[PDB]
Design a protein around this ligand. Structure first.
Ligand SMILES: C[C@@H]1N[C@H](CNC(=O)c2cc3ccccc3[nH]2)[C@@H](O)[C@H](O)[C@@H]1O
Ligand SMILES: C[C@@H]1N[C@H](CNC(=O)c2cc3ccccc3[nH]2)[C@@H](O)[C@H](O)[C@@H]1O
Ligand SMILES: C[C@@H]1N[C@H](CNC(=O)c2cc3ccccc3[nH]2)[C@@H](O)[C@H](O)[C@@H]1O
Ligand SMILES: C[C@@H]1N[C@H](CNC(=O)c2cc3ccccc3[nH]2)[C@@H](O)[C@H](O)[C@@H]1O
Lengths: 442, 442, 442, 442
C-alpha cells in the first residue's frame, strides 16, 4: 500500500489512462449559472490585476463581484433582481428543470473527451451532491438531486472517466469581505481549523461515494489542513491506484500540473505531465454576455489542443451549462466541431507521446506541431497550406518515408540543407479538414 | 502544583497504591457485547498480521470485522441479523436488563482485584456515561443509564480503586473504511482537529465527573491533540495526585507501561513499573464462541499473575460481560479460582517488590518466581513438586532460614555448589494449592 | 529553473538515459580494501540481525567490526596487524600502486555496463578525492591521487556515465562506539550541526568538481541537514538536468528507489523506477575469504539482470577491488561472462520497457521473463529447454508471428487453452547461450 | 536498549546506588581558584538579585565580576594583579603543584561521602581534562595534567562513585559582556550552533573517557542543542545503565532534581528524588575572604544532612580547593567532623527511605527528623535534650518497642494524647554526639 508520507506517495505517478487521454471536459455549474452574467473583459494573464476583480470575466465569480458595491455586477444585480435579493436565493432558483445527464455524457463523448470533471463545490460553497456536512447543497435546495452522483453514473455508462473539482482554497460561506485585489487572497480565506476539517471531510466523502478518477483541487489547500493530505492521498490511492490528483494543493505531491489561460502556459516541452484549462469563452461559469467574438472558433480549439498535446499536456476544456441544465448552443457547436476533427485525426493525438521537439514552422509562417507513437511521428500543421510545395524550417528527417496521414499516400520529400522539403499534391491538401497532417515513419 | 509541561510532569510517579495492588479487573463491555461473536483464532503476537483483522479474535472488534465484506463476521452477521441491520442498531438492543453493579463489585473483590477499569468508550465510539458530547451513549440509547458512574460508586463502596479506559486513538464513528492490515492504522483515523477536541473534552469530562484513579488510554492519542495532554495531565494530577496514566498516549509522560498478550511481554525484570493485560479467553469483548479450550485455566491464571508480579508488573485481567450485564459462567469460575488462590497466598503477592532475579527452575524443569517484602523473600513454584527433594538450579541463599509459607514450618536446606537444595516434607507439599510457596528470611 | 522546494523538485523525473541503461557497476573501494577481510556469513535479509554486526559479511564494515572486541574481525586484526595498529593506519597502506583507471573503465564497458559509481566516501569517512574539508582523503595519504577524479575521466572516456556514492548517514570519524544491533543506528550517528554542514559541503564539492550523473546517498541524510537537500537538489538539477538521485536521503524527493540483496526486492512490477544492488559475492568491499562458493555464477548473474530488468529496474552490480587497485580474477571472470551474454542478447535488455507482466513459466518449470520495445516483445527463458515442444503456462499471444531471437527464424506456435504452445527446433535451441530468447511481434 | 526519545528515556530512573548514597562531595576547582576571592555577601535566595552580580559571593564568578568595572572584584584585581592582567592568564598560575588526588579521595571517604563530582568545565570555559575540542584546558596550560582523569582514578580507588559537573549553559569564552542582572541570562549566552556542538561533543567525550556515574549539567542546555540530549542520554545509559543525570538541562528527562542554598529547598517530602547543594561557606570556588563566620559549623552540617535526608534527598556538599591543589583547613576540619558523626550514626542515614513524615518537634522546641529502614524508624533530634523526660509534639507510635540507637537500650515510652512521651536516662543522653538518636521498631 502507499503510506501516508510524501516520500512514499511519490511512488504514485500520473496513471497511463490520463497520459493517453489527452482531452477532457470541465463543467463549472452552480447557482451562479442562474444569473449567468459577467463583463467579458478578456483573458486571464492579459487583463491588469488591479482591475480584474472589479470587471471579473469569470461569471462563476458572481457573488464575489456582487459583494463589490458599484462593480458592473452590483449594478446589474440591483437592476435585475433588486437589492433585497441575496446571492444565496439563487440556490432555490437553480432547478435544472431540463437537465439530462445521459445527454451530456453522449455529447462529451461525441466531442472526443475521455474524462469529465464537474465542480462539486466552487468558491460560493454550494455543493452539488447530498453532502452530510452542509445543507447548502443540491439535494436540499434547488435541483432536489444528487447532481455529482447522477452525472458520474452517466459518464461512466458512456465509457468515460469521472473526476471531481473542489474549491478547497476558497469558500465564501466562511468570509464576508470580497476579493478586490490579488493580495487579498493572502488573508481573506476561511482560516479556521473548522474549515480545514470541513474540506477534509468533504473530499474524503467524495472519495467514499464516487471514487473519482481525478481529484481536482483549486485555490490551494487550507494551511491548517495540508498535513491531512498525506493521509487523504494514501487513503485515495489505496482504494484507487489509477486515481490522480492535480497540483493545486500546495503540498509536495501532485500527479500532473496545471495552467489556466495564459498563466503557467508552457512555450515548449515542460518535462512533466500537465493539463491546460480554459473556458470555450472567457468565463468558466455560463455568461449570457458572451457572443462568438469572445469564444474560440472550432479551428482555434483544434490548434489549442494540438499545441497542448505536442507539449505533453492534456486539454481540460470547460463548458458552462445554464441553470436549467442545458448547454448553450454556441458551446455545443464547438464541442461538436472538435469532436468532428478528433474523429478524423484522433490517431495522431490519443495515445501519443511528445517527440524531440514540439514545434516548427513553414518558411511562410504556418505553425507546426509534432506527436509520436513509437516510430511514427505525426506532423500536424496549424492550418492547411495553399501551395503544394511546403518548406519546413530548421528540420531534417531520417525517416525515409513520409505519408499524407488521412489518405496514407506516400509523399516525396528531401532535406535541403537546414530545411525539409515536401510536396503535397493539392488533391490531398484539399482532403484535410483544419490541419494538414503528415506522418513520418523512421 | 504540577505545571503543564513534561519536565514538571515527570515529578509524578506511579502511586504506591498501584505498585502495591498487583491485580486489577478490565471490563470490555459495550454494544458489541450483544452480538458477542468472534472467530477464536489465537493469541495476539502468534497470529500472522496479514490474516488477523480478517479473523479477528477480539469480539469487541465486531464492527470493523463487519465492515470487511466476506470476513467470517460479515457472513455471520448477515445470516443472524440480516444485511439491513447496521452495527449501530445494537445500541438499542444493549439493555443490561440483568445488570447489578454491586454484584460485579462483590465478585471482583472476592477474586482478589484491588482496582477496576471499564471501557468508557471503545473503538466503536459508543459511550457508557451520559457524556454531553455525543448522543451515542448509554443514557440515551440502550441501558438508559450511566454505566460508568453507577459502576464507579459500586466499586468504591467495595473498597476498590476505579479507573477508566478510553479509546482515544480510534473511533469508528469518524471513519468508514475498516482496518484490514496493520499498516492502515497509520492513515485510517479520525484525523481531524474536531476529533482531537472531542477526545480532550471527553477525558476532561471523565476526570470532572468521576476523578478516576487511572486514565487508561488506548491506540495512541490524536497527533493534533498530543500537546493538550500536558494540560490534561497537570489538570488531572492537581485534582488527584494519586491518579495515574498508562503509556498509550504517545507522549513523553506515563506512570506505568503496558503489554498485551505476547506484545511487549518482558522475559525478565524490565526496570520500570508495567501492567499486563489479556482476556480470560482470546478476546476482550464477550465471545459466545469461546469454550474452555480457549481460556486460561485457574492454574495458568495463577502462574500468569506470579510471573507478572515477580517482574514488577500488575496483571489487568479482562472480563467480557454479556449484553444483559451478566458475567459468563466460564469467566466467573476462573475469577473465583484465582480469588481462592489469592486468599491463601496473597501475602507473597500484594505489597511485594521484585528481588534480584525474577526467575529460577528446579533440576526437573519446574519454574520458580520470587517476590520480596523487606528481608522476606517469597519462593513461588509454578506447580507443586512430587518429590520431597527439590533441587533449585543456579541459586545459593545466605538467609539461614527457609520456611514453608502456608504452615510456617522451618525447613532444611543447604547450598550444594551452584544449586540450593531443600527438603519439603510431603505432608506440607500436599498442603499447598497450585503452587508450592516457600519463604526465605535473610 | 527548478526551485528549492519539494513540489518544484517533483517536476524532475528519472532521466531517460538511466531508465534505458539497465546495468551499472558499483565500486566499494577504500582503505578497508587493504585488510580486505570478512566472515562470509550470508546474504542481507537472510542473516539474523541479532548476529549480523558480530559476524558481518560486508568487508567494508571492518572498522565497525574491529571496534567490537571478540568479533572474528577483531581476532583476525590482532593476529595479522596487531593490537596497536589503528584502523586509520590502513590509509598509509592503501597505495593503489597497480591502479589503471582506463583498464577498469574498459573492463566495465566490455562487461556491458552503462554507468559506474564508486564510493567517494564510505562509512569510515575516508575520501577518495582531494576534498578541502578533511585531510583523511586519498590525496594527502595513501595513493596521493584523486581516485574519484581520475576514475571519472577514465569512465567518461570509455563513454560511460559516472555517478558518485556518498555516505551521508554514517561517518565513523564522528563516533567512537560500534553498531552492534540495528537499534544502535538510531542514535550512534554524527548528530551535529557541524556534520550536517560537512556532508552538504562535501556533496556540493562533488557536484562542483565532477557533476556526477547520479548522486547515490547511503544510510539516510542527517536530520539537521535534510532541509538542505531542497537547495542541493535544485542546485544540482539546474547544473545537470539529466542528473539523478537515489532514495536513501529520507526526504520527499527521489528519482529511483533501491533494493539491497533480499531487502525491498520486488516480486512483481512495482510501478516506479528502481535499481537492485549486491556484490558478486556477499560483500561490497573486497573479501579475500570468499571463493566461488560465495559468488554468483555467470548464469545466475544473467538470470538476475533479466529478472530485475523485466520488473523495470537497473542492476547496480558491485565490484570490490584490492588495496593495490586491481580487480580480483573471480570478479573480472564473472564481469566478462555477463558482457559476453549482453553482446549477444543486448537488444532484449538495453533500452527496453516493462510489458504487461514480468513473468511466466513453462509446464516443466523453466522461468520466463518479458521485456518490450514498442510492438516487439522479448521472451526470455531463464535457461534453455531441452525438448522442442515448449508449453508456456498461463499465456496467450495475439501477435500472429513469433521468431527465434538470435536467428530471426519464424517459429510455429498456437494458443492452447490458457497456455501458449511453441516448437523450437533443437538446432536453434542449441545456438542460444544461457537463455533461450524468443521475440514476438504483435 | 534505551531509545533516543523521551518516552523511552522515561524508563530510566534514579539508580539505587544514588538514592542510597545520601552524601556526595562537589568540587568547584579551576583557574578562578588562583585569585580565590569574592565579597561574602550572603546566601543565594537571601541577597537581592538587583545587587547579586555586583557583590557576587560565588568566587568562581570572578571573570564575570572582573568584566563589571567598578565591582569590588575589579578593584581587587587591579590593585593585586593589575589592569593588564587578563583573566585567562590565571591558567598559567593554576599549577596545582601540591595536588594529591589520593589524598583528596581519602579525605572524602573519611568524610562519609559516597560520590564525588568535580567541575570539568565551569562558566569561564576552562577544562580540567585533555579535551580535543579546546586548548584552554589543564593539559596544555597550567598543571599540564588531566585533573578530571587523575581524580577519577583516585576516587574510584577509594571505592567512591565519580560524576562530572559540566557548564552546558554558560561559557564566557563565547561572550564578552558580563551578566549584571538575572534578565541578562536570557540573552548573553553562546547562542551558536557551533556552541551547541561543542557542548554535545564535550559531554560525549567525558562519557567516552570516563563514563561518569552522574552527568551534572548546570545552567540549562543550549536551546539549539536540546534535541541532542535524547541521543546523548540514550548513548550514556546504554553504556552505563546505573549512570544518572540531574535536572538542569531544560528538557523532559531527569533522574533527580536539585536545590541550591535557599532556592527550591523543600519544606517537606517532595515526592521525587532530589539533592541539595551549597558550599561549606557562601562560595563554591575557594574564597580567601571567608572565615568561620561565613561557614557552617559541624553541628549545622549534620543538621543540614539529616534534614535533607529525612526529606528524601542527597546532600551534595561543595569543597573549594586552592590553586595549588590543597584543601583549606577550615574546610577539611568541617569535612572530618561530619565524617566523625557519620561513622557513629551512619546506619540512620545511609541506605534509608523517607517515612510518613519528615519532621516533628519537642514540647520545648528541639527539631526532630525521621528516616526509615523497613520496620526500623530512626528518630533524630537536631541536638541533645538536657532533661530525661522528652515530649514529642503531635506524634503517636504503634511500635511497642523504642530503643536508644547508640547503646541499643530499650526505653520507656507511652502515647500521651496527640503526643509521644519518652524517658531517656541522662547517661545515654550523655553518650550521643550531636544528635540524640532513637530507633523505633513497629
Ligand atoms: C478553473 C478556474 N480556477 C480559478 C482559480 N485559479 C487558481 O487558483 C490558479 C492556480 C493556479 C496554478 C497554476 C496555474 C494557474 C492557476 N490558477 C477559479 O477562481 C475559477 O473560478 C475557475 O474555477
Ligand atoms: C486492550 C486491547 N487493546 C487493543 C489495542 N492495542 C493497542 O493499541 C496496543 C498498543 C500497545 C502498546 C504496548 C503494548 C501492547 C499494545 N497494544 C484494542 O484494539 C482491543 O480492543 C483491546 O481494547
Ligand atoms: C551498498 C551497501 N549499503 C549499506 C547500507 N544500507 C542502507 O543504508 C540501507 C538502508 C535500508 C533501509 C531499507 C531498505 C534497504 C536499505 N539499505 C552499506 O552499509 C554497505 O557498506 C554498502 O555500501
Ligand atoms: C553549583 C552552582 N550553580 C550555579 C548556577 N545555578 C543555576 O544554574 C541554577 C539555575 C536555577 C534555576 C532555578 C533553581 C535553581 C537554579 N540553579 C553556578 O553559577 C555556580 O557557579 C555553582 O556552580
Amino acid at each position: 500500500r502507499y503510506k501516508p508520507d510524501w516520500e512514499s506517495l511519490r511512488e504514485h505517478t500520473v496513471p497511463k489512462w490520463f497520459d493517453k487521454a489527452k482531452f477532457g471536459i470541465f463543467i463549472h455549474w452552480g447557482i451562479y449559472s442562474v444569473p449567468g452574467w459577467a463583463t467579458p473583459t478578456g483573458e486571464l494573464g492579459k487583463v491588469p490585476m488591479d482591475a480584474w476583480f472589479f470587471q471579473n470575466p469569470y461569471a462563476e465569480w458572481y457573488e464575489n463581484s456582487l459583494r463589490i458595491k458599484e462593480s458592473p455586477t452590483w449594478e446589474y444585480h440591483v437592476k435585475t433582481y433588486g437589492e433585497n435579493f441575496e446571492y444565496e436565493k439563487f440556490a432555490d432558483l437553480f432547478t435544472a428543470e431540463k437537465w439530462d445527464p445521459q445527454e451530456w455524457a453522449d455529447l462529451f463523448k461525441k466531442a472526443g473527451a475521455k474524462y469529465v470533471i464537474p465542480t462539486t463545490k466552487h468558491h460560493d460553497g454550494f455543493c452539488l451532491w447530498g453532502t452530510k456536512y452542509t445543507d447548502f447543497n443540491s439535494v436540499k435546495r434547488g435541483p432536489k438531486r444528487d447532481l455529482v452522483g447522477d452525472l458520474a453514473k452517466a459518464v461512466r455508462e458512456a465509457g468515460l472517466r469521472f473526476g471531481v473539482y473542489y474549491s478547497g482554497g476558497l469558500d465564501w460561506r466562511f468570509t464576508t469581505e470580497p476579493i478586490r485585489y490579488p493580495e487579498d487572497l493572502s488573508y481573506i480565506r476561511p482560516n479556521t481549523y473548522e474549515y480545514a476539517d470541513y474540506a477534509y471531510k468533504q473530499v474524503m466523502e467524495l472519495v467514499d461515494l464516487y471514487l473519482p478518477d481525478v481529484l481536482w483541487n483549486d485555490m490551494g489547500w487550507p494551511e491548517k489542513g495540508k498535513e491531512d493530505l498525506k493521509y487523504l492521498f494514501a487513503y485515495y490511492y489505496n482504494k484507487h491506484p489509477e486515481g490522480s490528483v492535480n497540483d493545486r494543493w500546495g503540498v509536495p505531491h501532485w500527479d500532473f500540473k496545471t495552467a489556466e489561460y495564459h498563466v503557467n502556459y508552457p512555450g515548449d516541452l515542460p518535462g512533466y505531465k500537465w493539463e491546460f484549462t480554459r473556458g470555450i469563452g472567457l468565463s468558466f461559469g455560463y455568461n449570457r454576455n458572451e457572443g462568438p467574438e469572445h469564444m474560440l472558433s472550432v479551428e482555434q480549439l483544434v490548434y489549442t489542443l494540438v499545441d497542448v498535446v505536442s507539449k505533453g499536456g492534456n486539454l481540460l476544456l470547460n463548458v458552462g451549462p445554464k441553470g436549467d441544465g442545458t448547454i448553450p448552443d454556441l458551446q455545443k457547436e464547438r464541442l461538436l466541431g472538435l469532436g468532428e476533427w478528433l474523429r478524423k485525426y484522433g490517431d495522431a493525438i490519443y495515445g501519443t507521446s511528445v517527440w524531440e521537439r514540439c514545434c516548427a514552422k513553414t518558411e511562410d509562417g504556418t505553425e507546426i506541431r509534432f506527436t509520436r507513437k513509437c516510430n511514427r511521428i505525426f506532423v500536424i500543421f496549424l492550418g492547411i497550406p495553399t501551395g503544394e510545395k511546403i518548406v519546413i524550417e530548421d528540420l531534417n528527417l531520417s525517416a525515409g518515408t513520409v505519408r499524407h496521414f488521412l489518405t496514407g499516400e506516400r509523399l516525396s520529400f528531401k532535406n535541403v540543407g537546414k530545411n525539409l522539403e515536401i510536396t503535397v499534391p493539392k488533391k490531398l491538401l484539399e482532403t484535410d479538414s483544419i490541419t494538414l497532417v503528415l506522418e513520418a515513419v523512421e
